[PDB]
Amino acid sequence: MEYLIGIQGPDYVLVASDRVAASNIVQMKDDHDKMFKMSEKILLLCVGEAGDTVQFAEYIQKNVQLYKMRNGYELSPTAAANFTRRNLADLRSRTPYHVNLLLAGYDEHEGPALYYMDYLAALAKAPFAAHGYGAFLTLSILDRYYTPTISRERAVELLRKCLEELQKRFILNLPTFSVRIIDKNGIHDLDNISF
Amino acid sequence: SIMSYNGGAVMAMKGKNCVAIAADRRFGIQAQMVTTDFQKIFPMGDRLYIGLAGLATDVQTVAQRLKFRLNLYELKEGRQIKPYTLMSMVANLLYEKRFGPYYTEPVIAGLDPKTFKPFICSLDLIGCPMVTDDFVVSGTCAEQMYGMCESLWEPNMDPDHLFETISQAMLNAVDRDAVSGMGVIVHIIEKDKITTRTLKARMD
Amino acid sequence: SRGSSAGFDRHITIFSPEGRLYQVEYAFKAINQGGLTSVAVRGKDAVIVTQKKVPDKLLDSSTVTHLFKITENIGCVMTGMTADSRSQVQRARYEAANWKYKYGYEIPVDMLCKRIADISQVYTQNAEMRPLGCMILIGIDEEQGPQVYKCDPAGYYGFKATAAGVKQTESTSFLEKKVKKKFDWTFEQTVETAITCLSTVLSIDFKPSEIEVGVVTVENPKFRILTEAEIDAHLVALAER
Amino acid sequence: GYDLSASTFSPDGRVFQVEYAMKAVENSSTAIGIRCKDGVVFGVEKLVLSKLYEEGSNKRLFNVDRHVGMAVAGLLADARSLADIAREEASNFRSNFGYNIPLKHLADRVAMYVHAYTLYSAVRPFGCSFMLGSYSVNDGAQLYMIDPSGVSYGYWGCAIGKARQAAKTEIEKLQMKEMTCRDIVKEVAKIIYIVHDEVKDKAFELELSWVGELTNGRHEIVPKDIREEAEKYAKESLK
Amino acid sequence: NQYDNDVTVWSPQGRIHQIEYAMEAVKQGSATVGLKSKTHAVLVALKRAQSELAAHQKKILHVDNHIGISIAGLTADARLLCNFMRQECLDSRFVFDRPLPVSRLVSLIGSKTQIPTQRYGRRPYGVGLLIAGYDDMGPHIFQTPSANYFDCRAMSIGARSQSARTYLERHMSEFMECNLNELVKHGLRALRETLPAEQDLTTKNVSIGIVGKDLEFTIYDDDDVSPFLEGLE
Amino acid sequence: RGYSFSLTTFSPSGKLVQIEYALAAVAGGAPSVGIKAANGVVLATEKKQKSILYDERSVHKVEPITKHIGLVYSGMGPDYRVLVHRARKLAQQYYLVYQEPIPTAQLVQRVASVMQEYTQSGGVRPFGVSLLICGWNEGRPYLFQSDPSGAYFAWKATAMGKNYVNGKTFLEKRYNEDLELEDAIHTAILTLKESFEGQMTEDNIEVGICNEAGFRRLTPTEVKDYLAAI
Amino acid sequence: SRRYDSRTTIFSPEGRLYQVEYAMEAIGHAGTCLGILANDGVLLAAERRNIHKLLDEVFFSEKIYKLNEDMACSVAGITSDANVLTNELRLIAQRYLLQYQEPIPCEQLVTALCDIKQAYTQFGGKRPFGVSLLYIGWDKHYGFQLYQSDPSGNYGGWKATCIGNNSAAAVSMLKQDYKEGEMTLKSALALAIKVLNKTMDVSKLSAEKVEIATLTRENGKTVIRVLKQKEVEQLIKKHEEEEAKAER
Amino acid sequence: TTIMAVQFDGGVVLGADSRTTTGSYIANRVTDKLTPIHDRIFCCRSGSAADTQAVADAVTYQLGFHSIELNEPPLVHTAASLFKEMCYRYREDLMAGIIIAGWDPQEGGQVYSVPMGGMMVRQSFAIGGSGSSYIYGYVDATYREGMTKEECLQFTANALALAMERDGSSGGVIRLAAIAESGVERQVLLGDQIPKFAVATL
Amino acid sequence: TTIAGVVYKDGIVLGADTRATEGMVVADKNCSKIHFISPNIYCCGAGTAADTDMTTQLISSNLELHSLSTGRLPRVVTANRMLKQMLFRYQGYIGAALVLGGVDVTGPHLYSIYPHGSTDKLPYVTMGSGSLAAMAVFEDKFRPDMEEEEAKNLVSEAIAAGIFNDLGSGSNIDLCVISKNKLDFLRPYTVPNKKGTRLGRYRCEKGTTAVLTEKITPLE
């Protein structure tokens, strides 16, 4: 099962994702990128049932690019998250997309925005969120230490404590972790955290 | 149950010249709490709110299609909607998915924009309108809420004591429900103002 | 104006510079091209009478008819083009049997003639077909007694006594003078007045093979088509007056 | 003009495409049919335009059900289409209602199908007239005739085509109500060789079929010796 | 003037001018001749080059093992009708496991070409055919624009074909008892009546189709036409 | 098959000439007058009735749609019955969706669209009917007028049909806002009396009113009650 | 059939579409309707055609149509074509607000309706809609805007323009007097009725007179308000006062 | 549920019980189980309660319009073929075994068993319903070729009374109908008028 | 759910309870189960409440079409045909078992319509969970051609027995009287069940419940 985590700060969002792609007893990819760039100020994190993830994420991604082509400006993360929610909810048809999502975005009127979404397309905005069975192990530490005014290096430390809990207690081999931060200057890639 | 996968519990209660509507704030996945500030009560007018409990994705689906139809209604007509018409619209919208039903049981509480008569009602998940004169409740702890409101309700209350009884009903009902609680918002709809309050509740 | 024309307003059903529909006006001439005349009248107990032309001796006269049975309680006489007549009878049979199937009771007479008129209007609105150039209905409504209705190719339609075809206006004028003599402007000798009216404007003084008569009565609500000897008996009973 | 479309009335109340198709009917050769006591007999002057043609080409007697026959006049390409409509209509009636279709109902189905083209500018009216004959023990014998306007009637004896009036004049001389069909074959062959225009169209064939009691309601062609005896009798009566 | 623009307009004589104009498309094309014995059916057709090195458009299409057709007129309409007859014989083989009888197949073509001759916006097919086939009933020669079709003993359609009809009217008494060698030679002389007087039948511009009891249908082209071209005159 | 091209096309002066011909088809129709009173609305119309053989109870020109919405016309009858059947079909779909009697403005904005579609769709002519739709809702009366173009207006008193210009002059002379409904019928009959020509009876006019009680036609004895005074 | 097909969707001998030009000739007789973009809002100022005595004054507007919470529009041309197109405008704006949960940017609505108006000029064989539409609206991207559309499917952004009767003479004054970037609501209301006193040459101005509506932002909410009778009569007395003071 | 039709010379005699149960509770004890499809053609309804009323309206519609066009009283075989087509066309969504009986001037009294399947077979007598299993052996033994009308009414009443005695899903009153050229003569046998068979006591 | 009906001398008397339960909990105390359909036809709805709600809206709407179209008051058999055709078209997936009672020009009628589209014509009906208890009272006490008051007391007694002897019903008796000359919709007719008096008082004063946030939004 795949792991997601995102932390929304005062003027930033920190997201992280596991870098493993597995098959039934073995992992086939140890540099797996689950972070799909939607535009200059929004990332879409995509885990779940295989096939539905990359198809759904790229089908959203070409419409997010297409709105910029038609209009000359970007979708707000509220509008893009509601658009993604509408396409995922439009479920009671034949076609299931059993995807678990996080959308992180920075708006140039509202600041940092982080959106949680399950496979029902229940959209819930949260100060921090996490997917996978590792969420059951790490959201409690997030409730332990998170304050609304965490500065970004303390957020890297709080992320590192959660990743060390993945190493210590969680039974799946999750050794390498990619991390990005979205700001007013766009998307920033950080160094891979490894164990 | 499919209704109890997210939890949730909303009630309404009629007062003298005012209505009160309160919904829980827990957004849940069967055991895991995710957030504690989930909005279920949406404004559909100046003095008319709708509350939707149940499956939290169907709350947002039904409420977006409802706002889509209601904005076309209020732009085409040139008036605010009367609550009985909103009850018929939501029952129509749910019954259009009769054999594909949404998992939400909406409650409606508001004031008539001309007569200012109090109105409350609830529905089932497929569109039976139930207009009652005392209270309507909806969600996974329905027995707790009927148990509190059957004993605490008294007719012709001022907004202060209506706030007191709906707050005691919510807080004593949701503390016997595992999958609901975690904070509650209370909306008092009066003729001249709306009072929006949140309460001290158990967070376990 | 006074007969002005703009383009194709004499070829299809579009408005003239005055507001007349020329093809709908021209459809009434096709009723006169049929060369026949029918008379219908009702009393307190309705009757339709029309001519029967046998120009060819080769005809089987059992199959030449302008009196049609729509349902068991409602009969009808057509006037005009013959194939259009049998078409609109087939359509009236289908609507009368469709009303019974949807609604569970035998169709009213006015709700049959309103339905046939709402069908016939569509040909006066859509440009790609021609209006059917050809109907008088009789039947016992339970509360109003006998009914006599006449729909026309323009889509209009409620009568006490009427005529159709070539000698429409003169037989109309004869019945219009006769109603003023009758008490409460309503008839008494139903079977006989139609024969006098038909024989007056045509001046033929018919044979029993020349006219056919159908009656609907309060005692027998079924539409009933009379035999030859009975029409001969009414012709001779009128002959000895 | 007022005559380029079947969906336009003239100022006098005539529909000219139908009345022009009735001129197209009486261009074609003579076909007559005589109803009698116990059945119906048909007779068609079948021209053969050139001696290269096989026997049996351009049949103008069609079978439209196993108890119903058909005689046509006019543009034959339309008449084969109406033969296939009548065949499908009798087939659907046997399938739905479980018994052989009454000829009154069959003629009033096919007459409505013919009439359905005299209303629209998107089609043209059929250029053909036709007769339907049958016999059964319950119904007697019946002969109905349809022209391109769509109007059908029941007949004792009919003639269609370019020699209509002289053939009806000669049919009316006959006491068809009391004769056996074996007499009716010779009497039909009489009128066909009477009305023939030998100077204008040269090579032609006699085609005859009956339906009646003597075939137990089955529509069959006249056997070869009876056709040749009718041809001999009528050609000697031509004299 | 006004009645020649639509197939769905009766002219006041009781005719349809757009149908009679479609027969000019068969009266201009390269002529062809058909004939039969009691054992064989033979089509002989002029092959059309635009002048030359474009090497002479086929007139005789291999339609089944047991049916071949000849063309005179709009070539794409006849190719449409060839694919139609291919599909009908293949549906008869797929359902009933015997090839469809030719007399029913030509009535199906007469049913198909009839439908555009009545419905507005359409045109009549501008092609007349000679159809040669063999079935249980023996060899057949049919002729089909105005949707009428004909059974024929020997028949000549196309440009100036009345001379070839005259030659076949002269010599049709012989044909049922002539063998396969003589039968094609009669039709070759029949077409050669129509030709320009300078041009003769060569291995270029004359095609031959042959079908018989023991012999499936073969189009005879450049090399294979050489025996029947030998011993003519 | 049905044609797919429109027959209402722009003239070089910008006029949809079929609509301006259908309005002349309206002007030749039987005259009709509607007046909005203070406490309700009155509709009244001339019955174009020759020929004593007519049974007057078979056709009605003032035809109701709901319990408080009715309408009258001037122009071609068989198009008016098409509009009545369609207007009822729209009002009952409104009553299915919202469980409310339809607002009169919300029935006019749909009937006017149905009349609009035939001035632009393929192979149809425009309607030859100008309507007057009345309604009482929100304790306030309405009077509307729809045209064959599909446009609609809100009136206090108006007239259509034969000699409608003189009807509008007589209404602007005789209108005041405080009119009671029993006087509103009387002014409407005095308006229709201008061009009746031929001894008005209870059988050759048709008067409908709408008030707090609902919409109803007046029975011919109640027609004769007012017409005895006229 | 082909005798009756008027061919509304074909080219001219010069590359013109005659029905699209005749639509504009129909627009040239429609009501004078101008709108002026200012700093803190946009107005619309139109001539009412409902000028007979016996009218009812039922709606709050005659030619002003609210399209969503953030936009309004005016029309000129056939009334019924305008009703059909503004129903389509409302459906487009609410499909967008359905799909993205934010109100639509003001240009997407105009280009969508010009797509719809462009489609009927090319195929389908219908007649084209003969209406102009003026478009006001606020959004968070560019604030207060103005557009003008035609039956051909063109659109442009303007700060002041005028359609309908006497269009060019009104836009000629608007070129003269527009203070670019300095206009308030009040100075724009002065300027619009200054021009409307110069273009309403039928029945020199009396009280009911116009429909004039403004679009403003108050407390983070967009308001579109049609001026009452009392407000317009006071504003036109103020204009006639300014016309009195104009000489000396 | 026990329906029965018996062909005699000049017409048919029908019979039916009057008990309609849902589970083991009698929902209606005066049910009328003979439906007039035309004047002198009756169909009987055993099996699914919805389908045998739903198809019969379509067959009544088609047969009435057919009889108007053909200007005749419609045949009984026509009324059986209109069921044989339709109950076959929807046979997996119908549970309908119909017993059509009636009269026509052309072929006399006719009884057609249309069993569950959409076939058609004419029989001298037809029994149907849940209770018919208990009275197969009676009617194989009692039926004689060519009984009169009164003999047939007593035979139908006896054979119905035996099935109403033995089957718990049948009971009530016996509704008879005798369809002939003179018309339809219906009668109801209630209480003591039902033929009584003494219990095998001692 | 306990509804009933009788055919008496001048028309139809319909009755109902008012208790509507969801799960095994009383949800509504004063639910109206006697639907308006026509001025003469009323339709008691048992079973699935939302399905019979939208059904007695839709058939009421179609009768509002038809009575205006023909200009006459509608027959019972018209609503019967529309109900049985729609409920057969949905094959009983509408879980509404109906009592369609009315008076038309041929006198009173009483039809019971099962959800699959089978119809019965009856002199007296009972439906719902407490149908058997009221059916006992009808089999005990019904007579043909009863008067008005005897029929009203009979239906009220039968609804009373179905109230006391079933868990699935209770707390009111509604009636309806339909005839040629009158329409009497008696809501409620008798109230056999009464809430007990609350012995203690639990009125919480202001300040009893703690408040965290408060926002006052003024309106006009």
UniProtKB/Swiss-Prot annotation, chain C:
Coiled coil: none annotated. The modification Phosphoserine is found at S16, S61, S62. It comes from the Eukaryota. It is found in: Cytoplasm; Nucleus. CDD domains: proteasome_alpha_type_6 (cd03754). The modification Phosphotyrosine is found at Y156. Gene3D superfamilies: Glutamine Phosphoribosylpyrophosphate, subunit 1, domain 1 (3.60.20.10). GO terms for cellular component: cilium; cytoplasm; cytosol; extracellular exosome; mitochondrion; myofibril; nuclear matrix; nucleoplasm. Glycans are attached at S4. The keyword Lyase does not apply. Belongs to the peptidase T1A family. The 26S proteasome consists of a 20S proteasome core and two 19S regulatory subunits. The 20S proteasome core is a barrel-shaped complex made of 28 subunits that are arranged in four stacked rings. The two outer rings are each formed by seven alpha subunits, and the two inner rings are formed by seven beta subunits. The proteolytic activity is exerted by three beta-subunits PSMB5, PSMB6 and PSMB7. Interacts with ALKBH4. This is Proteasome subunit alpha type-6. It comes from Homo sapiens.
UniProtKB/Swiss-Prot annotation, chain D:
The keyword Acetylation applies. It is found in: Cytoplasm; Nucleus. One of its GO terms (molecular function) is ubiquitin protein ligase binding. SUPFAM superfamilies: N-terminal nucleophile aminohydrolases (Ntn hydrolases). Pfam families: Proteasome, Proteasome_A_N. The modification Phosphoserine is found at S237. One of its GO terms (cellular component) is nucleoplasm. One of its GO terms (biological process) is proteasome-mediated ubiquitin-dependent protein catabolic process. Belongs to the peptidase T1A family. PANTHER family: PROTEASOME SUBUNIT ALPHA/BETA. The 26S proteasome consists of a 20S proteasome core and two 19S regulatory subunits. The 20S proteasome core is a barrel-shaped complex made of 28 subunits that are arranged in four stacked rings. The two outer rings are each formed by seven alpha subunits, and the two inner rings are formed by seven beta subunits. The proteolytic activity is exerted by three beta-subunits PSMB5, PSMB6 and PSMB7. Interacts with AURKB. Interacts with CDKN1A. Interacts with MDM2 and RB1. Interacts with the C-terminus of TBXA2R isoform 2. Interacts with DNAJB2. This is Proteasome subunit alpha type-3. It comes from Homo sapiens.
Swiss-Prot record, chain H:
One of its GO terms (molecular function) is endopeptidase activity. It is found in: Cytoplasm; Nucleus. The chain holds residues 35 to 236 of 239 of the full protein. One of its GO terms (biological process) is proteasome-mediated ubiquitin-dependent protein catabolic process. It catalyses: Cleavage of peptide bonds with very broad specificity. The modification Phosphothreonine is found at T35. The active site is at T1. Keywords: Acetylation, Cytoplasm, Host-virus interaction, Hydrolase, Nucleus, Phosphoprotein, Protease, Proteasome, Threonine protease, Zymogen. GO terms for cellular component: cytoplasm; cytosol; extracellular exosome; mitochondrion; nucleoplasm; nucleus; proteasome complex; proteasome core complex. This is Proteasome subunit beta type-6. The gene is PSMB6. Belongs to the peptidase T1B family. Induction: Down-regulated by IFNG/IFN-gamma (at protein level). Up-regulated in anaplastic thyroid cancer cell lines. Component of the 20S core proteasome complex involved in the proteolytic degradation of most intracellular proteins. This complex plays numerous essential roles within the cell by associating with different regulatory particles. Associated with two 19S regulatory particles, forms the 26S proteasome and thus participates in the ATP-dependent degradation of ubiquitinated proteins. Its EC number is 3.4.25.1. It comes from the Eukaryota. Signal peptide: none annotated. It is an enzyme of class 3 (hydrolase).
Swiss-Prot record, chain I:
Signal peptide: none annotated. It comes from the Eukaryota. The active site is at T1. It catalyses: Cleavage of peptide bonds with very broad specificity. One of its GO terms (molecular function) is endopeptidase activity. One of its GO terms (cellular component) is secretory granule lumen. GO terms for biological process: proteasome-mediated ubiquitin-dependent protein catabolic process. Expressed at a low level in colonic mucosa. Up-regulated in colorectal cancer tissues. It is found in: Cytoplasm; Nucleus. Its EC number is 3.4.25.1. It is an enzyme of class 3 (hydrolase). Its main location: cytoplasm. Keywords: Cytoplasm, Host-virus interaction, Hydrolase, Nucleus, Protease, Proteasome, Threonine protease, Zymogen. Belongs to the peptidase T1B family. The 26S proteasome consists of a 20S proteasome core and two 19S regulatory subunits. The 20S proteasome core is a barrel-shaped complex made of 28 subunits that are arranged in four stacked rings. The two outer rings are each formed by seven alpha subunits, and the two inner rings are formed by seven beta subunits. The proteolytic activity is exerted by three beta-subunits PSMB5, PSMB6 and PSMB7. Component of the 20S core proteasome complex involved in the proteolytic degradation of most intracellular proteins. This complex plays numerous essential roles within the cell by associating with different regulatory particles. Associated with two 19S regulatory particles, forms the 26S proteasome and thus participates in the ATP-dependent degradation of ubiquitinated proteins.
